[PDB]
Amino acid sequence: MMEEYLGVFVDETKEYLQNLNDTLLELEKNPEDMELINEAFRALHTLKGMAGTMGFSSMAKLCHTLENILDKARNSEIKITSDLLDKIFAGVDMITRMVDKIVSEGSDDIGENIDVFSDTIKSFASSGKEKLE
């Protein structure tokens, strides 16, 4: 059978999420080393792509969201305030839940809320209270 292509595709995404949690959980203790920010901004960028080729963009958008905070972190827009990373680790949390159901059935539909979980984090950083009247 030629199904081992997807069996290895996930075994790599899981070993990377941890490697990406070690980077993001070490990033919290070192949210400015610029190594955990690039070690994560990358894996998440690679994890997001692997989630698009799997037909699970709902879980890939989560990989792009986290990497987005790691992007502003590398773009000088945001920094790991222990909250932008908590929601990020929260995205990797659902990404795992989808992987647990995707592995149990292959569906990334966990009633998650990307546009929301991202807007929550996207608004949790760039803010402009009181603007133009």
mmCIF file of C-alpha atoms in Angstrom:
data_model
loop_
_atom_site.group_PDB
_atom_site.id
_atom_site.type_symbol
_atom_site.label_atom_id
_atom_site.label_comp_id
_atom_site.label_asym_id
_atom_site.label_seq_id
_atom_site.Cartn_x
_atom_site.Cartn_y
_atom_site.Cartn_z
ATOM 1 C CA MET A 1 0.000 0.000 0.000
ATOM 2 C CA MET A 2 1.266 3.534 -0.728
ATOM 3 C CA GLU A 3 -0.174 5.190 2.406
ATOM 4 C CA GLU A 4 3.078 5.466 4.320
ATOM 5 C CA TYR A 5 3.508 8.882 2.677
ATOM 6 C CA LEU A 6 1.007 10.377 5.106
ATOM 7 C CA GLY A 7 2.075 8.125 7.998
ATOM 8 C CA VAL A 8 5.564 9.686 7.931
ATOM 9 C CA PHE A 9 4.316 13.179 7.100
ATOM 10 C CA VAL A 10 2.688 13.300 10.555
ATOM 11 C CA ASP A 11 5.418 11.464 12.506
ATOM 12 C CA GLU A 12 7.566 14.393 11.398
ATOM 13 C CA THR A 13 5.052 17.124 12.300
ATOM 14 C CA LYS A 14 4.739 15.734 15.852
ATOM 15 C CA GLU A 15 8.483 15.343 16.450
ATOM 16 C CA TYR A 16 8.750 18.931 15.222
ATOM 17 C CA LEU A 17 5.915 20.431 17.302
ATOM 18 C CA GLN A 18 7.773 19.284 20.395
ATOM 19 C CA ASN A 19 11.014 20.489 18.919
ATOM 20 C CA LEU A 20 8.917 23.560 18.212
ATOM 21 C CA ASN A 21 7.581 23.568 21.755
ATOM 22 C CA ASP A 22 11.067 23.264 23.074
ATOM 23 C CA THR A 23 11.913 26.277 21.000
ATOM 24 C CA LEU A 24 8.732 28.102 21.986
ATOM 25 C CA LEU A 25 8.919 26.946 25.594
ATOM 26 C CA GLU A 26 12.559 27.928 25.703
ATOM 27 C CA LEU A 27 11.637 31.028 23.806
ATOM 28 C CA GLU A 28 9.570 32.085 26.813
ATOM 29 C CA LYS A 29 12.703 31.928 28.964
ATOM 30 C CA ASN A 30 14.472 33.428 25.967
ATOM 31 C CA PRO A 31 12.034 35.434 23.974
ATOM 32 C CA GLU A 32 14.756 37.690 22.538
ATOM 33 C CA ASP A 33 17.588 35.250 21.796
ATOM 34 C CA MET A 34 16.411 35.517 18.187
ATOM 35 C CA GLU A 35 17.313 31.834 17.924
ATOM 36 C CA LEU A 36 14.160 30.389 19.447
ATOM 37 C CA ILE A 37 12.257 33.038 17.484
ATOM 38 C CA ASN A 38 13.875 31.884 14.226
ATOM 39 C CA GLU A 39 13.978 28.232 15.255
ATOM 40 C CA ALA A 40 10.235 28.450 15.754
ATOM 41 C CA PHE A 41 9.330 30.960 13.011
ATOM 42 C CA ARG A 42 10.953 28.381 10.698
ATOM 43 C CA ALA A 43 9.569 25.060 11.986
ATOM 44 C CA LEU A 44 6.143 26.731 12.158
ATOM 45 C CA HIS A 45 6.649 27.935 8.584
ATOM 46 C CA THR A 46 7.662 24.385 7.652
ATOM 47 C CA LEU A 47 4.920 22.861 9.832
ATOM 48 C CA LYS A 48 2.328 25.167 8.238
ATOM 49 C CA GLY A 49 3.350 24.110 4.714
ATOM 50 C CA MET A 50 3.219 20.411 5.661
ATOM 51 C CA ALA A 51 -0.320 21.153 6.903
ATOM 52 C CA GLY A 52 -1.308 22.636 3.532
ATOM 53 C CA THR A 53 -0.063 19.645 1.526
ATOM 54 C CA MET A 54 -2.083 17.406 3.855
ATOM 55 C CA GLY A 55 -5.348 19.130 2.903
ATOM 56 C CA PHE A 56 -5.528 20.451 6.483
ATOM 57 C CA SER A 57 -5.096 24.219 5.976
ATOM 58 C CA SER A 58 -7.301 24.775 9.016
ATOM 59 C CA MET A 59 -4.376 23.417 11.013
ATOM 60 C CA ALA A 60 -1.767 25.036 8.749
ATOM 61 C CA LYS A 61 -3.197 28.502 9.374
ATOM 62 C CA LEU A 62 -2.462 27.758 13.025
ATOM 63 C CA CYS A 63 1.156 27.043 12.104
ATOM 64 C CA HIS A 64 1.293 30.337 10.181
ATOM 65 C CA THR A 65 -0.344 32.265 13.038
ATOM 66 C CA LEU A 66 2.301 31.268 15.617
ATOM 67 C CA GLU A 67 5.033 31.895 13.049
ATOM 68 C CA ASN A 68 3.409 35.266 12.501
ATOM 69 C CA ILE A 69 4.141 36.297 16.080
ATOM 70 C CA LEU A 70 7.584 34.922 15.565
ATOM 71 C CA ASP A 71 7.582 36.985 12.401
ATOM 72 C CA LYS A 72 6.810 40.294 14.106
ATOM 73 C CA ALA A 73 9.245 39.132 16.758
ATOM 74 C CA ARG A 74 11.788 38.955 13.944
ATOM 75 C CA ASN A 75 10.229 42.026 12.282
ATOM 76 C CA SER A 76 10.509 44.083 15.493
ATOM 77 C CA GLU A 77 6.711 44.314 15.781
ATOM 78 C CA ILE A 78 5.921 42.015 18.715
ATOM 79 C CA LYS A 79 7.752 40.052 21.409
ATOM 80 C CA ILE A 80 6.945 36.992 23.538
ATOM 81 C CA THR A 81 5.000 38.679 26.327
ATOM 82 C CA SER A 82 4.090 35.261 27.802
ATOM 83 C CA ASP A 83 0.648 35.912 26.269
ATOM 84 C CA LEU A 84 1.427 36.020 22.542
ATOM 85 C CA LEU A 85 3.314 32.778 23.153
ATOM 86 C CA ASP A 86 0.558 31.284 25.347
ATOM 87 C CA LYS A 87 -1.961 31.720 22.521
ATOM 88 C CA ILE A 88 0.707 30.454 20.142
ATOM 89 C CA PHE A 89 1.255 27.336 22.262
ATOM 90 C CA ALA A 90 -2.534 27.268 22.282
ATOM 91 C CA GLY A 91 -2.525 27.109 18.486
ATOM 92 C CA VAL A 92 -0.003 24.263 18.648
ATOM 93 C CA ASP A 93 -2.364 22.748 21.238
ATOM 94 C CA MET A 94 -5.287 22.562 18.811
ATOM 95 C CA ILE A 95 -2.885 21.677 16.003
ATOM 96 C CA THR A 96 -2.162 18.656 18.211
ATOM 97 C CA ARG A 97 -5.847 18.021 18.977
ATOM 98 C CA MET A 98 -6.521 18.060 15.220
ATOM 99 C CA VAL A 99 -3.544 15.733 14.802
ATOM 100 C CA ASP A 100 -5.039 13.463 17.487
ATOM 101 C CA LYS A 101 -8.358 13.379 15.631
ATOM 102 C CA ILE A 102 -6.722 13.548 12.198
ATOM 103 C CA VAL A 103 -4.691 10.558 13.338
ATOM 104 C CA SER A 104 -7.901 9.022 14.704
ATOM 105 C CA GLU A 105 -9.925 9.886 11.597
ATOM 106 C CA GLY A 106 -7.952 12.350 9.451
ATOM 107 C CA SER A 107 -10.079 15.465 10.083
ATOM 108 C CA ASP A 108 -8.641 18.769 11.294
ATOM 109 C CA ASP A 109 -12.181 20.051 11.947
ATOM 110 C CA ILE A 110 -12.068 20.553 15.744
ATOM 111 C CA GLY A 111 -14.531 23.478 15.868
ATOM 112 C CA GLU A 112 -11.359 25.573 16.262
ATOM 113 C CA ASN A 113 -11.342 29.315 15.454
ATOM 114 C CA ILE A 114 -8.295 30.425 13.435
ATOM 115 C CA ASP A 115 -9.593 33.783 12.176
ATOM 116 C CA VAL A 116 -10.410 34.209 15.857
ATOM 117 C CA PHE A 117 -7.437 32.549 17.547
ATOM 118 C CA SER A 118 -5.280 34.597 15.189
ATOM 119 C CA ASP A 119 -7.282 37.793 15.517
ATOM 120 C CA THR A 120 -7.074 37.302 19.264
ATOM 121 C CA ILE A 121 -3.314 37.050 19.053
ATOM 122 C CA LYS A 122 -3.059 39.562 16.188
ATOM 123 C CA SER A 123 -5.013 42.049 18.280
ATOM 124 C CA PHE A 124 -3.105 40.970 21.378
ATOM 125 C CA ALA A 125 -0.048 42.647 19.843
ATOM 126 C CA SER A 126 -0.542 45.502 17.349
ATOM 127 C CA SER A 127 -3.037 47.766 19.156
ATOM 128 C CA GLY A 128 -4.078 51.389 18.520
ATOM 129 C CA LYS A 129 -6.467 52.436 21.316
ATOM 130 C CA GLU A 130 -7.878 55.902 20.532
ATOM 131 C CA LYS A 131 -6.968 56.522 16.872
ATOM 132 C CA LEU A 132 -8.081 59.288 14.475
ATOM 133 C CA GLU A 133 -10.928 60.717 16.595
#
